Amino acid sequence: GSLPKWNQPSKEGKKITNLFVNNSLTHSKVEFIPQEGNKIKWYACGPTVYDAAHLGHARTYVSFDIIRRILVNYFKYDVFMVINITDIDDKIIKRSVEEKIGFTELARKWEYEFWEDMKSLNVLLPTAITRVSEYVGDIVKYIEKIIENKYAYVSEEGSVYFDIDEFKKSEKHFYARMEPLSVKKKKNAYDFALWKSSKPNEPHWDSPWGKGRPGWHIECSTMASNILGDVLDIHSGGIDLRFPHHDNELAQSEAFFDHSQWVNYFLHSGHLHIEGLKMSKSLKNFITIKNMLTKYTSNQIRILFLLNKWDNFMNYSPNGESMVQCIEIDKSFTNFFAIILMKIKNFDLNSCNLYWSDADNKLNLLFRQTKNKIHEHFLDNFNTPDALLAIQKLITEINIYMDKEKIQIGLLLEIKHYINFIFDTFGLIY
């Protein structure tokens, strides 16, 4: 009917938190319902490992790390996550001849440094790490099934292409669900390659159609489908990937399983722009995660991303201009934990009075209110900027209470623990 349709999961038997997430399939905020129980099957597109990672990559993976911590630590969902490592790619192939070291040896180098940068930022590793080099055989069988479903064709040179026209014809299949308006050997220019016949002096793999490499998009559909299956609760990535990469993943997986909805919720992180231009290796405006870590700490970098809503675009000001606010917040969190611990330590039950005073009750009321504010923020599509503000306000009032008033030791311990619980959800470490 010229409009793509979206089927919300049924609510019976599912964990309902009334969480709302910005879903790129509906281009709106919708209630999140698991496919099965409280389980969330989640695939996230990974890096292409030919170079150092930069602050833009940090934005995406730290942002979805925070969302993952919110889902699992805060809401107690059960998340099964997969991230691919794209270790075969044209950029890796070209760089390996420039570097005069093996392609595989170059790919491990930058995958290792990528995971070390993620660990440095306190990013949790996914459940499964799926490398393209280890899945080429699975990829080929995936392409075969797409061909048997008559949604792909083979060129004489030995490449394989996705037949978009055959895909559209089916009433159950719509091409480019998320960006409908973004649309030689080929039937049509809009067809894309699943298998590429191998260029000379290029790494290659055996296949029924000839020596070749996987195409850009087939890696993700194959790996995600083998481990997670015919329905994905969440698929994530940066916004630039929405078309053509993610829409093509949907086309390949729908073609493979012959069904209409491979993914219930598609989440796209907004881009990090430096001076109004996206941070890209090509532009030469980029800042490596390692350089960033020599001036600033993991907490400060995470606070930078906490201050910017995950699905919005953000602008980083270099020379620490944007980092000035972050350093202030990290400095005050550190000082807070210092004080409240000294006051808990020096508290003496025998000499203090433990009457529940009016000052105590006022702080307690603010403490329970702040718990409910933060809960609404997380339900409001992971509004970490406002949740972080709630904690700062609560800390300002705790500082006043501790300085003057007589302190209820138990109340202060409870508040320290809640703030610890929220900071663990953020990935901050104090």
Ligand X SMILES: Nc1nc2c(ncn2[C@@H]2O[C@H](COP(=O)(O)O)[C@@H](O)[C@H]2O)c(=O)[nH]1
Point out which residues bind ligand X (CB under 6 A).
Answer: 2, 45, 47-48, 56-57, 59-60, 168, 174-176, 180, 183, 237-238, 240-241, 269, 271-272, 278-279
**Segment 34 to 63, residues that bind Zn ion, using CB under 5 A:** 45
Strands 28-31 and 20-23: what pairing?
A: antiparallel
Phi-psi region of 18 (alpha: psi -120 to 50; beta: other; left: phi over 0): left
Q: Rank residues 61 and 75 by Cβ distance to ligand X and give the closer one.
A: 61
**Segment 260 to 289, residues that bind its own copies, using CB under 8 A:** none
Task: Give the separation between CA 109 and CA 334, rounded to whole angstroms.
Answer: 35
Radius of gyration of the chain (CA): 25
Shortest spacing between CB 341 and Zn ion, in angstroms: 32
Show the tokens assigned to 257: 């399983």
Q: Rank residues 166 and 240 by Cβ distance to Na ion and give the closer one.
A: 240
**284 Cβ partners below 8 Å, 6+ apart?**
none
The residues pairing with 267 across neighbouring beta strands, listed in sequence order, are 236
With 0-12 / 13-18 / 19 or more C-beta atoms within 10 angstroms meaning exposed / middle / buried, residue 201 is exposed
Choose among Zn ion, ligand X, Na ion, none what residue 310 binds, the Cβ cut-off being 5 to 8 Å by kind.
none
Q: Rank residues 25 and 81 by Cβ distance to its own copies and give the closer one.
A: 81
Q: Which of 42, 114, 243, 378 binds Na ion (CB under 5 A)?
A: 243
* 240 interacts with Na ion by CB under 5 A: yes
Taking CB under 8 A as the binding criterion, the range among 124-132, 293-301, 304-312, 388-396 that sits at the site for its own copies is 124-132
* 419 interacts with Zn ion by CB under 5 A: no
**Segment 74 to 103, residues that bind its own copies, using CB under 8 A:** 74-76, 78, 80-82, 85
Task: Give the separation between CA 295 and CA 322, rounded to whole angstroms.
Answer: 13
350 to 346, 347, 353, 361: CA distances (angstroms): 12, 9, 8, 22
304 to 125, 321, 426: CA distances (angstroms): 21, 11, 12
Within 182-270, residue ranges assigned H as helices are 218-227, 245-257
Shortest spacing between CB 27 and Na ion, in angstroms: 14
Choose among ligand X, Zn ion, its own copies, none what residue 115 binds, the Cβ cut-off being 5 to 8 Å by kind.
its own copies
Show the tokens assigned to 210: 């000839």
Taking CB under 8 A as the binding criterion, the range among 180-188, 203-211, 298-306, 408-416 that sits at the site for its own copies is 408-416
* 108 interacts with its own copies by CB under 8 A: yes
User: Among 420, 385, 200, 203, which Cα is nearest to 302's?
Assistant: 385
The residues pairing with 29 across neighbouring beta strands, listed in sequence order, are 22
**4 Cβ partners below 8 Å, 6+ apart?**
25, 174, 177, 180
Choose among Na ion, ligand X, Zn ion, none what residue 2 binds, the Cβ cut-off being 5 to 8 Å by kind.
ligand X
Choose among its own copies, Zn ion, ligand X, none what residue 220 binds, the Cβ cut-off being 5 to 8 Å by kind.
Zn ion
Taking CB under 5 A as the binding criterion, the range among 29-37, 101-109, 212-220, 320-328 that sits at the site for Zn ion is 212-220
Strands 232-238 and 263-269: what pairing?
A: parallel
With 0-12 / 13-18 / 19 or more C-beta atoms within 10 angstroms meaning exposed / middle / buried, residue 410 is exposed
Taking CB under 8 A as the binding criterion, the range among 122-130, 204-212, 233-241, 249-257 that sits at the site for its own copies is 122-130
Q: Which of 67, 82, 88, 220 binds Zn ion (CB under 5 A)?
A: 220
Choose among Zn ion, ligand X, Na ion, none what residue 243 binds, the Cβ cut-off being 5 to 8 Å by kind.
Na ion
Q: What does 254-294 look like in DSSP terms, one character per residue?
A: HHHHT-S-SEEEEEEEPPEEETTEE--TTTT---BHHHHHH
Choose among ligand X, Na ion, Zn ion, none what residue 251 binds, the Cβ cut-off being 5 to 8 Å by kind.
none
Q: Rank residues 174 and 333 by Cβ distance to ligand X and give the closer one.
A: 174
Q: Which of 28, 182, 335, 361 binds its own copies (CB under 8 A)?
A: 361
Choose among Zn ion, Na ion, ligand X, none what residue 34 binds, the Cβ cut-off being 5 to 8 Å by kind.
none
Shortest spacing between CB 126 and its own copies, in angstroms: 5
- 424, 73 in Cβ contact below 8 A? yes
Which residues here bind its own copies, judged by CB under 8 A?
37, 39, 74-76, 78, 80-82, 85, 108-109, 111-112, 115, 124-131, 134-135, 226-227, 349-350, 353-356, 360-361, 364, 368, 371-372, 408-411, 413-414, 417
Which residues here bind Zn ion, judged by CB under 5 A?
45, 220
